[PDB]
């Protein structure tokens, strides 16, 4: 019902899309009735380390803009000592909501989304960023295309995407940690669950994730290339696990 000004430009609020700490996301229209998302962050409570993680993520977002269109667009922002406004690309729906709603997935759509995920994460890795907390909610469907919305710098199931080396760390986290998590995302898109969704007791689930005697199941599916990808991503030893550059040359993404 209200206005917002970001760098002298006035935006009308259609609805709130998002909650968070200490952020709200709004679907808004500019004066030409073009649709945007505006992320508002309140900075009144934020301490200096937090402030710096916010500035650091904005800066990477801003920079990684020009390197890939599988990173959400940040069009502009206004930052003061009281608040951040970020004017961004508006999404249709996040991947986690889409997956909960979708009964089965088209193999073409799945392969396309996987390519998009790979291209976004590859990009951040090239600039030295390991996300370390990849989940479907980090991706947004925009224009039939998946985009990474978050780099894991500021925000810092949900345990279902956690890699074994993060759990054994309890330094070991590398770009390969993101391959495990992506692998879990593709496993879900393939077999309709994450690999350890079955294990409800959390102490147990975590032990499963790190236990090499616990064999992950890969039921036979018509795409043998896809099976192979899941198996290569879901290797517990990160040195034996496939890398992003290798995953980009894989027949699953290169051939059809």
UniProtKB/Swiss-Prot annotation:
ATP binds at residues 17-25, 39. It comes from the Eukaryota. Disulfide bonds: none annotated. GO terms for molecular function: ATP binding; identical protein binding; kinetochore binding; protein serine kinase activity; protein serine/threonine kinase activity; protein serine/threonine/tyrosine kinase activity; protein tyrosine kinase activity. Signal peptide: none annotated. Changing residue 158 to A: Loss of kinase activity. GO terms for biological process: chromosome segregation; female meiosis chromosome segregation; meiotic spindle assembly checkpoint signaling; mitotic spindle assembly checkpoint signaling; mitotic spindle organization; positive regulation of cell population proliferation; positive regulation of SMAD protein signal transduction; protein localization to kinetochore. This is Dual specificity protein kinase TTK.
């Amino acid at each position: 019902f209200q206005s917002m000004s970001v760098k002298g430009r006035i935006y009308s609020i259609l609805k709130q899309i998002g909650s968070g700490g200490s952020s709200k996301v709004f679907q808004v229209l500019n004066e030409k009735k073009q649709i945007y998302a505006i992320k508002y962050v309140n900075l009144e409570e934020a301490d200096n380390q937090t402030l710096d993680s916010y500035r650091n993520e904005i800066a990477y977002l801003n920079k990684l803009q020009q390197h890939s269109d599988k990173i959400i667009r940040l069009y502009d922002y206004e930052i003061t000592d009281q608040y951040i406004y970020m004017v961004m690309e508006c999404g249709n729906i996040d991947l986690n909501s889409w997956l909960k709603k979708k009964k089965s997935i088209d193999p073409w759509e799945r392969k396309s989304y996987w390519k998009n995920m790979l291209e976004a994460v590859h990009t951040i890795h090239q600039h030295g960023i390991v996300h370390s907390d990849l989940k479907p909610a980090n991706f947004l469907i925009v224009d039939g295309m998946l985009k990474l919305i978050d780099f894991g710098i500021a925000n810092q199931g949900t345990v279902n995407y956690m890699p074994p080396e993060a759990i054994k760390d309890m330094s070991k986290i590398s770009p390969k940690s993101d391959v495990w998590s992506l692998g879990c995302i593709l496993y879900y898109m393939t077999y309709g669950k994450t690999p350890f969704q079955q294990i409800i007791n959390q102490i147990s689930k975590l032990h499963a994730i790190i236990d090499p005697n616990h064999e992950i199941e890969f039921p036979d599916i018509p795409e043998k290339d896809l099976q192979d990808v899941l198996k290569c991503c879901l290797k517990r030893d990160p040195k034996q696990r496939i890398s992003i550059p290798e995953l980009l040359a894989h027949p699953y993404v290169q051939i059809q």
